[PDB]
Design a protein around this ligand. Structure first.
Ligand SMILES: CC(=O)NCCc1ccc(O)c(-c2c(O)c(O)c3c(c2O)C(=O)c2c(cc(O)c(C(=O)O)c2C(=O)O)C3=O)c1
Ligand SMILES: [Mn+2]
Ligand SMILES: [Mn+2]
Ligand SMILES: [Zn+2]
Ligand SMILES: [Zn+2]
Length: 144
């Protein structure tokens, strides 16, 4: 179906995606910040922390060009997306019911692209891209 890049695409816009949700109210936020002066954040209800991370990747896919670099802190989101790509049309593959709909809409957007670089970085303190989208999605959701 597809195969992602092992290194980021030189020259392409980078999307620092992030998502945050509250367990008690199920309210959440998902968005991104880019290295070309672009940002977005959406408010979500009846969501989970894993659902907000996948939604942030979906927003970066629909708002980017044919070549996109995406930096997430989500090992689940990177894992469940990469495993879907590596195990399509294979024998021992079974789709997880956990967020089956949301991941399916991401794969449909992934195929429409020509070059996608998905990488995981740990959530860190600083002034970099992951730290800016961090404060945007956590505002009013969790204490940082
Ligand atoms: C970092 C820090 O001390 N202060 C900065 C503000 C602050 C305070 C507490 C936080 O918890 C975070 C915080 C984030 O903002 C955030 O976005 C994330 C995490 C965070 O912890 C994760 O932990 C985390 C995240 C994605 C993952 O996929 C995993 C996984 O896949 O396993 C984990 C994991 O926990 O394992 C993730 O996206 C941010
Ligand atoms: Mn995150
Ligand atoms: Mn974060
Ligand atoms: Zn191209
Ligand atoms: Zn950073």
């Amino acid at each position: 179906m597809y195969q992602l890049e092992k290194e980021p695409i030189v020259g392409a816009e980078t999307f620092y995606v992030d998502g945050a949700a509250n367990r008690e109210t199920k309210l959440g936020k998902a968005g991104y910040v880019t290295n070309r002066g672009r940002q977005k954040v959406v408010t979500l209800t009846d969501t989970t922390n894993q659902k907000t991370e996948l939604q942030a990747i979906y927003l970066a896919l629909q708002d980017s060009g044919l070549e996109v670099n995406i930096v997430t802190d989500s090992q689940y989101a990177l894992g469940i997306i990469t495993q879907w790509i590596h195990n399509w049309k294979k024998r021992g593959w079974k789709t997880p019911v956990k967020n089956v709909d949301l991941v399916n809409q991401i794969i449909e957007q992934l195929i429409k692209k020509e070059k996608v670089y998905l990488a995981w970085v740990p959530a860190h303190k600083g002034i970099g891209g992951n730290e800016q989208v961090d404060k945007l999605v956590s505002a009013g959701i969790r204490k940082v």
